[PDB]
Amino acid sequence: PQVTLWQRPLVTIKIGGQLKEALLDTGADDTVLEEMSLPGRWKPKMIGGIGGFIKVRQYDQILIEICGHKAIGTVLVGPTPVNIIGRNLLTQIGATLNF
Amino acid sequence: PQVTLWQRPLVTIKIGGQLKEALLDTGADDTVLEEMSLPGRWKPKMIGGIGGFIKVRQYDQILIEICGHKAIGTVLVGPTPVNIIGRNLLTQIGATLNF
Numbered sequence A, B: 001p002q003v004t005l006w007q008r009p010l011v012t013i014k015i016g017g018q019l020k021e022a023l024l025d026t027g028a029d030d031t032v033l034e035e036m037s038l039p040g041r042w043k044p045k046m047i048g049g050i051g052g053f054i055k056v057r058q059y060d061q062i063l064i065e066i067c068g069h070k071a072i073g074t075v076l077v078g079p080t081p082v083n084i085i086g087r088n089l090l091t092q093i094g095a096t097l098n099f
């Protein structure tokens, strides 16, 4: 859909069987979701924001349905306040920005 | 234009007669800018982010030109790694997210 930006662009995602809201974020290179339980193995990596660097777990090959469109990619879960869908998935869902 | 999200959506702003490069960021509610010289009539504020809080100077009624659309709004200057155009301005250049 076209989303305007008078409101936060939130979408439901279904991930790991769980349903969440998540912010569509063209500013973020990566997708980071708050702690939740995901299956599979995983690695520790850390990422920056404003404010500073949080430690996180890299999960690869993980399947998300984002607004129902589907996709697989790396998710980082860790201490965010908001679950963020960043350009690695926004690209598979085919998102664009138009001005 | 239409920005595809393979690469970061960087754009040039002219702000206070200085030329910067910034990120069009749909997940940020405000515009925050690295430290720079502004005509200093401003207030303390603190914005939150990933990985912590940072402390910013709030200026409003700043004219910004973000591509040749001028937009006027509140700008938070402060210790961010990257200049970020958030939704308060994007709505003013009319930007949309689409998929």
Ligand SMILES: C=CCN1C(=O)N(CC=C)[C@H](Cc2ccccc2)[C@H](O)[C@@H](O)[C@H]1Cc1ccccc1
Pocket (backbone or CB within 6 Å): A025, A026, A027, A028, A029, A030, A048, A049, A050, A081, A082, A084, B025, B026, B027, B028, B029, B030, B032, B047, B048, B049, B050, B081, B082, B084
């Ligand atoms: C990867 C996420 C870090 N990040 C943030 O820290 N902020 C903060 C910007 C205001 C919000 C995400 C956010 C929104 C609301 C609450 C918490 C986080 C932006 O929307 C994100 O793109 C991004 C901007 C950024 C890019 C590169 C280096 C530093 C920062």
